[PDB]
Amino acid sequence: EKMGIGGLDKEFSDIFRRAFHVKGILLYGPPGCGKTLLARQIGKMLNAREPKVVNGPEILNKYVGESEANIRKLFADAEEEQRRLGANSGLHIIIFDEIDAICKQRGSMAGSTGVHDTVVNQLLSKIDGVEQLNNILVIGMTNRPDLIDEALLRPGRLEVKMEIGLPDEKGRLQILHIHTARMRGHQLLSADVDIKELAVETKNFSGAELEGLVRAAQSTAMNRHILQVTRGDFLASLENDIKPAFGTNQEDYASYIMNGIIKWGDPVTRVLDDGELLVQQTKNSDRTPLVSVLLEGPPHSGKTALAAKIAEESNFPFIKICSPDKMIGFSETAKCQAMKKIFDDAYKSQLSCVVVDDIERLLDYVPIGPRFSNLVLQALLVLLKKAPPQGRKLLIIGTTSRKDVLQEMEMLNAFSTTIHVPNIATGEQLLEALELLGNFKDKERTTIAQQVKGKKVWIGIKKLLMLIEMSLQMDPEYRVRKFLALLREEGA
Amino acid sequence: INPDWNFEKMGIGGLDKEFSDIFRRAFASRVFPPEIVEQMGCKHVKGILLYGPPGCGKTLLARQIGKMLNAREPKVVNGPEILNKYVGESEANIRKLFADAEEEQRRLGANSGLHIIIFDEIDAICKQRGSMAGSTGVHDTVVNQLLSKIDGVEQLNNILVIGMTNRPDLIDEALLRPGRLEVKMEIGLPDEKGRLQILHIHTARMRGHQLLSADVDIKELAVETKNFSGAELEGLVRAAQSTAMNRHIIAEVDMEKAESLQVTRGDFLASLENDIKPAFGTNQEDYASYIMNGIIKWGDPVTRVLDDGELLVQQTKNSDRTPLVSVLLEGPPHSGKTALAAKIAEESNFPFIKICSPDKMIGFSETAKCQAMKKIFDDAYKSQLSCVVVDDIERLLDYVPIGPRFSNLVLQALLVLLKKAPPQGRKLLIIGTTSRKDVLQEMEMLNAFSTTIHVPNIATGEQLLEALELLGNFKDKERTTIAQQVKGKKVWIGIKKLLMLIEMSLQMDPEYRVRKFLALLREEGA
Amino acid sequence: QEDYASYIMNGIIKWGDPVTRVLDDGELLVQQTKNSDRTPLVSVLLEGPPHSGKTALAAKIAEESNFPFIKICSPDKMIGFSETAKCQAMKKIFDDAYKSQLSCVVVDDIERLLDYVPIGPRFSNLVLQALLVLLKKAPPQGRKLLIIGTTSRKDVLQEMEMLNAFSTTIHVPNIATGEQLLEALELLGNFKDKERTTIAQQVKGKKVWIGIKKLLMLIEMSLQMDPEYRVRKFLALLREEGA
Amino acid sequence: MAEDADMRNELEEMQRR
Ligand SMILES: Nc1ncnc2c1ncn2[C@@H]1O[C@H](COP(=O)(O)OP(=O)(O)OP(=O)(O)O)[C@@H](O)[C@H]1O
Ligand SMILES: Nc1ncnc2c1ncn2[C@@H]1O[C@H](COP(=O)(O)OP(=O)(O)OP(=O)(O)O)[C@@H](O)[C@H]1O
Ligand SMILES: Nc1ncnc2c1ncn2[C@@H]1O[C@H](COP(=O)(O)OP(=O)(O)OP(=O)(O)O)[C@@H](O)[C@H]1O
Ligand SMILES: Nc1ncnc2c1ncn2[C@@H]1O[C@H](COP(=O)(O)OP(=O)(O)OP(=O)(O)O)[C@@H](O)[C@H]1O
Ligand SMILES: Nc1ncnc2c1ncn2[C@@H]1O[C@H](COP(=O)(O)OP(=O)(O)O)[C@@H](O)[C@H]1O
């Protein structure tokens, strides 16, 4: 039985399994995931035992000896119940929270603080001293294991350590089912509610954080400004999720992809089908553990959008995009640090696709007095070639506006199955793309059509898309003349 | 049960929707038929916090909500006073802080006192669990006791804490989440509307009085006062009443005489004069240092260039397919590029405008010269809309003709920040100056800049003579002496050099001014 | 003494004469070390074009010797390290190697280790001279340690006066002839004789120069939807390198 | 160096019976 938790069967069974008399149960991970509800449920589900509310650093007293006096008084089991009732089996449990303030490595840490301020020795020694008091059980909840795990663990007393806290991308349904149970039984909840529809935006939005929005969805309905009752609508949920609460989200992408992908010709379809073929090559093949491609285009044709499209088209567990947009100013060494960080994240994931955009300005290339970041170059180049450990697989797709430099520096050989993105081929493509966008209409289209075939045109769409705007702003009479003037200015 | 029944939205103006959020987060679950609240099965919220920058009246919310709610007066915490030398006492003061509350929870639990605490300046008491902030002794870690009392095993549904900071990110990850600190929201530098409303609140009592605030025109004052907010905004009038009455108080002797005159009005022009004394957080007042004599309209080129400026302004203001737009205005040296890039901002009338220039930083290494720029553009992103100026690219990225020398990290950061648009919904304008464009062509930045302007310099006498009728300092006799010689010369020179040479040439002699003017003008040109 | 499948994941093939030609002399030189009284150490190159598979060949040489102690010095574990710690690690590896009774150590992608770029030759001379001393640093004791260099291009090493310090060298030519190409493909067993006949007519007549690590990749890239018509794709891919 | 390591200590004995 699992009620009130609703998060996971996995840990609720795994903590009990290969545990149940054990002593030293310890619980860690990121904050939340009902580490308190664990106690609040299991203490009751077990044989009617004292919860023993304890407030962590409360043991600390200014007087000498009273600190240890509290914790020796606290147990009250080794004293009597070890023998009494003919039991030789206790049920008493002690629960402590935020143990980090209570415990440190050997007492000298965070200031070499004094002997009576830092005595872990009492509890280090109780269990591994005179005897193993095995009639009771301790629960330690630490939300910051790094501080105490390294120096407070001895196996047999504290070999138990279990990371907790996955989002449970289907179990969060079961979680919120509890806190919505009463709103469902009572005729409050809406008919248009798709519970999976509202929860599938909660990929990293943790079940612990996933009750504030429910309080807010109740409350926005309650909201009366400066009668009707029971109007618990669904409208509140999406606004609550987008604005009041976001937490540990750590997800930022799909702003390099902007205005969508428009098939202004066969070349776009070609390159996208090639990327599709290549991701299938990754997925369905051994002896190809990592694939590495670079797509060259001239500037302002758009290549980061293409790379992000290839990413988003294909379902993956791990995708990440490396740009200087985030790490401007981070010097030659911090840049490679970040890069090897995300590639180690990939090497942990089982199947992944990483993108690098604009290496030409990542590795700090300048044409005059040519110079660049030798170290990040030489790290990136070996990362292109470094296979993951085994059986998992990687993609690395790259953009740049200049491949002559890369051929000169031998990066091109290391890349595999490079490709070429074109500019706008001709005015036919140009004007059908204009009509595809819908920023112009058929009359001015026909007007443009006069001067198309006489002059060939080599232009990037990003520049075109910026360029149209000032003319659109300009009055409808001087719009098209200014547009064509700029088009004959650039790309002749 | 309910608040004191006298609130009626007293105390605040400018923050209306955030206080509405406070209603519908905090007070809703309280103010409702409680039988139907049992039908809900939702626990009440605790843990408001306010992370606004200095000013903007966060404290006044923290006071007025307590004025509203009917309960035992909130136990203020005037910053850290819980800390004490004897360890355990710092940790244990909080139980005393919560004791009466949990007493009312346990005894007489159903309908409760609803006690509140203010807990100001969390930035002192809470930290990153002792790992950060140097070696903070375990006395510092009272956060653990606080956590365990607010959401630990024993739970409370009868009390709410408030928080108040100037630096929220310094707080640990733990508290800010729901159950401990449910609602987080800045208190922002208010818009013109809210600034009008707040100024109206302070002036209202005097306006109500018959003899005060004559011709004050608070709406004019609002549109004048751009970034003043909160404490600065009300300190303005806290100085203006004083300026109004210094007239009366001094008559410099032992006794101070103002007794006959109590007709004081607090006139407008005192407040206008007063605006000079306070300085706002953003050092945008000193436009003059960039534009010391303004722009004199000579010929069509300046008109055309400023027309392009307003065109570009309204372009970014209107469109969403270019949330960013980037242009330098090229010119030869001494042609007023910086000034003519400031005037477009003055025409644009955007809320957030800033000029990044080496004038601000004189001796900063390339790295700090980059991070300052990063701060500036981050603030511009943080605003809805903005205009950034980069004056003397040639100087920001250092540039010397002898050899190819410059700082490349400056350039990379700048170029990246050009291509990097702000987030969804935000918009931006970035504009730059330089006396040199072939360099920028060589290093491939003129590509990234979306378009260009070539600002001219004075080319011929039919421009120069009108420019010289402007700017005074001359008359028709000197003008006639000039016009024949200048017309043949067809001089090419820049305005800043002009405005300097004129002053030095004129200093020498009432008669011999032209004999020096033209004599030195022979050098530049031809 | 790792398993070293990460450096050889697919396998080692003798596609023709040159593989036995090289590793014969490799094991020969190993036995020469094992019976060297004069010279405690030796140093070889496995030079060749970059996709020859020389790394895997070095690993095979090592594991055929079956020395007690063998280790790698590679950027894949030395990534992002400044030159002084790169030197520190590649030095302490040899400091750990000298104490064992006898050993081979291998250094792979010397150039990527050395941070070499050709636009305007630049690199860390620090690690270079750290390596030129370690080539010739005889251990104090009689114990013998050999060195296996895995360069990609030779002209630059002899331009920095490095081969004269190295004891000897190997040229590892890649696939040269269409029949040897075809035999390696037959060994790898991707295409049947049905397709191999077409391959035989198309590329057998004219010799082609191709690296094998590029080959086994591009066959996988053309593998998709192979039954109907991927041989033409393979052919057009091969045509641009070898002609 | 890591200068300015100035640190402070607290009473925890409070000797009393
Ligand atoms: N399929 C597509 N076809 C044409 N244009 C596209 C497509 N997808 C996106 N775009 C356009 O590409 C632009 C951005 O391209 P991207 O940012 O990848 O290159 P870029 O950074 O502008 O190039 P550079 O780095 O040379 O400046 C967007 O403004 C968008 O309108
Ligand atoms: N409606 C209002 N909006 C904004 N500010 C106001 C309003 N009414 C009064 N004030 C002014 O706001 C000030 C409150 O200061 P505030 O708490 O905002 O500064 P603070 O820097 O946040 O202080 P601290 O950070 O130390 O708590 C008062 O001194 C008062 O003059
Ligand atoms: N359009 C204009 N017409 C007339 N005068 C101008 C104009 N713009 C600026 N000025 C004058 O020029 C002065 C400022 O010169 P400014 O600082 O722009 O030179 P600068 O751009 O730094 O020169 P350089 O780029 O060669 O270093 C102001 O005092 C102003 O009066
Ligand atoms: N005869 C062979 N001997 C060794 N390896 C071979 C042979 N034929 C094919 N290979 C394959 O070649 C791959 C090794 O390539 P290697 O690491 O030598 O390239 P590389 O020299 O690192 O390229 P670069 O020098 O450009 O980094 C192995 O995966 C291996 O299966
Ligand atoms: N299924 C659940 N998962 C996570 N948190 C939940 C769940 N159900 C309820 N909670 C909330 O979690 C809080 C307790 O979380 P806790 O484990 O103390 O977090 P932390 O470890 O960060 O202190 C309660 O206040 C409760 O509202």
Residue A385 has what DSSP assignment?
Answer: H
- What HEC string does chain A produce? CCCCCCCCHHHHHHCCCCCCCCCCCEEECCCCCCHHHHHHHHHHHCCCCCCCCCCCHHHCCCCCCHHHHHHHHHHCCCCCCCCHHHCCCCCCEEEEECHHHCCCCCCCCCCCCCCCCCCCHHHHHHHHCCCCCCCCEEEEEECCHHHHHCCCCCCCCCCCCEECCCCCCCHHHHHHHHHHHHHHHCCCCCCCCCHHHHHCCCCCCCCCHHHHHHHHHHHHHHCCCCCCCCCCCCHHHHHHHHCCCCCCCCCCCCCCCCCCCCCCCHHHHHHHHHHHHHHHHHHCCCCCCEEEEEEECCCCCCCHHHHHHHHHHCCCCEEEEECCCCCCCCCHHHHHHHHHHHHHHHHHCCEEEEEECCHHHHCCCECCCCECCHHHHHHHHHHHHCCCCCCCEEEEEEEECCCHHHHHCCHHHHCCCCEECCCECCHHHHHHHHHHHCCCCHHHHHHHHCCCCCCCCCECHHHHHHHHHHHHHCCHHHHHHHHHHHHHHCCC
At A257, the amino acid letter reads: I
* A216, β-bridge pairs: none
- Ligand 1 atom closest to A256 (CA): 17
Question: Residue A245 burial by CB count (10 A; 0-12/13-18/19+): exposed, middle or buried?
Answer: buried
A424: nearest Cα among A274, A275, A268, A286: A268
- Ligand 2 atom closest to B60 (CA): 14
**C231 and C198 Cβ atoms separated by less than 8 Å:** yes
Let me know if domain C174-240 sits in CATH 1.10.3720.10.
no
**C62 and C147 Cβ atoms separated by less than 8 Å:** no
* A163, β-bridge pairs: A28
Residue B400 has what DSSP assignment?
Answer: B
Alpha-carbon span A389 to C29, nearest angstrom = 32
Ligand 1 pocket at CB < 6 A: A 258-259, 261-262, 268, 299-300, 302-305, 358, 401, 461-462, 465; B 419
Name the one residue in this structure whose structure tokens are 């549904």: B157
> Roughly what angle, to the nearest 10 degrees, separates helices A121-128 and A66-75?
30
Say whether D10 and B135 touch across the interface (CB within 8 A). no
Residues in chain B: 526
Give the H/E segment covering residue C72. strand C69-73
- Looking from the CA of A481 toward its CB, the CA atoms found within 13 Å total 5
Residue C76 is nearest to which of A333, A382, A405, comparing CB atoms?
A: A382
Task: Give span(s): CATH 3.40.50.300, chain C.
Answer: 1-173
* Approach to solving: cryo-EM
B316: nearest Cα among A254, A487, A472: A472
Whole-number Å distance, alpha carbon C10 to ligand 4 midpoint, is 10
Say whether C5 and A390 touch across the interface (CB within 8 A). yes
**B11 and B62 Cβ atoms separated by less than 8 Å:** no
**A372 and A365 Cβ atoms separated by less than 8 Å:** yes
Residue B23 has what DSSP assignment?
Answer: I
Q: Are strands A351-356 and B386-390 parallel, antiparallel or unpaired?
A: unpaired
Contacts of C among chains (3+ CB pairs under 8 A)? A
Alpha-carbon span B379 to D16, nearest angstrom = 57
Q: Which ligand sits closest to the CA of B342?
A: 3
Alpha-carbon span C76 to C99, nearest angstrom = 25
**A483 and A471 Cβ atoms separated by less than 8 Å:** yes
At C50, the amino acid letter reads: P
Nearest residue (CA) to ligand 2, atom 20 = B54
B40: nearest Cα among B150, B155, B157: B157
Q: Looking at C54, C60, C86, C144, which residue is catalytic?
A: C54
Ligand 5 pocket at CB < 6 A: A 5-7, 31-37, 143, 175, 207-208, 211; B 151, 179
* Sequence-distant contacts of B26-29: CB under 8 A, at least 24 apart: B26/B65, B26/B160, B26/B183, B27/B3, B28/A218, B28/A219, B28/A222, B28/A223, B29/A215, B29/A218, B29/A219, B29/A222
Tell me the CATH architecture of domain B457-523. Answer: Orthogonal Bundle (1.10)
Alpha-carbon span C32 to C42, nearest angstrom = 9
How far lies C169's CA from each of B453, C29, C44, C55, C163, in Å?
A: 62, 11, 5, 14, 8
Whole-number Å distance, alpha carbon A446 to ligand 5 midpoint, is 64
B232 lines ligand 2 (CB under 6 A): no
Q: Are strands A393-400 and A351-356 parallel, antiparallel or unpaired?
A: parallel
Looking at 3.90.70.10, 1.10.357.10, 3.60.15.10, 1.10.8.60, the CATH number of the domain A423-489 comes to 1.10.8.60
Alpha-carbon span A398 to A400, nearest angstrom = 7
Fold exhibited by the domain A252-422:
Rossmann fold (3.40.50)
How far lies A437's CA from each of A441, A461, A468, B323, in Å?
A: 10, 11, 11, 18
B498: nearest Cα among B476, B475, B518, B477: B518
Alpha-carbon span B232 to B239, nearest angstrom = 10
Size of interface B-D (CB pairs under 8 A): 16
Sign of the CA dihedral A358, A364, A366, A370?
negative
Whole-number Å distance, alpha carbon B200 to ligand 2 midpoint, is 16
Strands, sheet with A93-97, edge to edge from the N-terminal-most edge strand:
A93-97, A137-142, A26-28, A162-163
How far lies B51's CA from each of A242, A418, B18, B102, B185, in Å?
A: 20, 50, 13, 28, 7
Quick check: helix, strand or coil at residue C192? coil
Size of interface A-D (CB pairs under 8 A): 23
Name the one residue in this structure whose structure tokens are 């999720």: A241
Judge whether A295 is closer than 8 Å to chain C, CB to CB.
no
Please tell me the class of the C1-173 domain: alpha beta
A144: nearest Cα among A194, A100, A200, A206: A100
On chain A, the residues whose CB falls within 8 A of the CB of C119 are: 370, 405, 408-409
Name the one residue in this structure whose structure tokens are 């149970």: A181
Give the H/E segment covering residue A180. helix A171-185
Fold exhibited by the domain B286-456:
Rossmann fold (3.40.50)
Q: Does residue B419 have an active-site annotation?
A: yes
Judge whether B25 is closer than 8 Å to chain A, CB to CB.
yes
Residues in chain D: 17
B234 lines ligand 2 (CB under 6 A): yes
Contacts of B488 (CB under 8 A, 6+ apart): none
Q: Looking at B316, B338, B433, B434, which residue is catalytic?
A: B338
**C64 and C224 Cβ atoms separated by less than 8 Å:** no
Alpha-carbon span A163 to C66, nearest angstrom = 42
Vertex C126, ends C121 and C130: CA angle to 5°? 120
Say whether B86 and D10 touch across the interface (CB within 8 A). yes
Residue B169 has what DSSP assignment?
Answer: G
At C41, the amino acid letter reads: L
Alpha-carbon span B280 to B232, nearest angstrom = 7
Sign of the CA dihedral B482, B488, B490, B494?
negative
Judge whether C89 is closer than 8 Å to chain A, CB to CB.
no
Say whether B447 and A299 touch across the interface (CB within 8 A). yes
Say whether C109 and A375 touch across the interface (CB within 8 A). no
A158: nearest Cα among A23, A310, A295: A23
Residue C117 has what DSSP assignment?
Answer: B
Q: Looking at B46, B127, B149, B337, which residue is catalytic?
A: B337
**B23 and B157 Cβ atoms separated by less than 8 Å:** no
Alpha-carbon span A110 to A104, nearest angstrom = 9
Residue B443 is nearest to which of A100, A218, A367, comparing CB atoms?
A: A367
Q: How far is CA A138 from the centre of its chain?
A: 33
Alpha-carbon span A322 to A343, nearest angstrom = 10
Judge whether B421 is closer than 8 Å to chain A, CB to CB.
yes
B461 lines ligand 2 (CB under 6 A): no
Which tokens hold the place of B31?
A: 């103010």
Alpha-carbon span B277 to B275, nearest angstrom = 6
Nearest residue (CA) to ligand 4, atom 10 = C53
Task: Give span(s): CATH 1.10.8.60, chain C.
Answer: 174-240
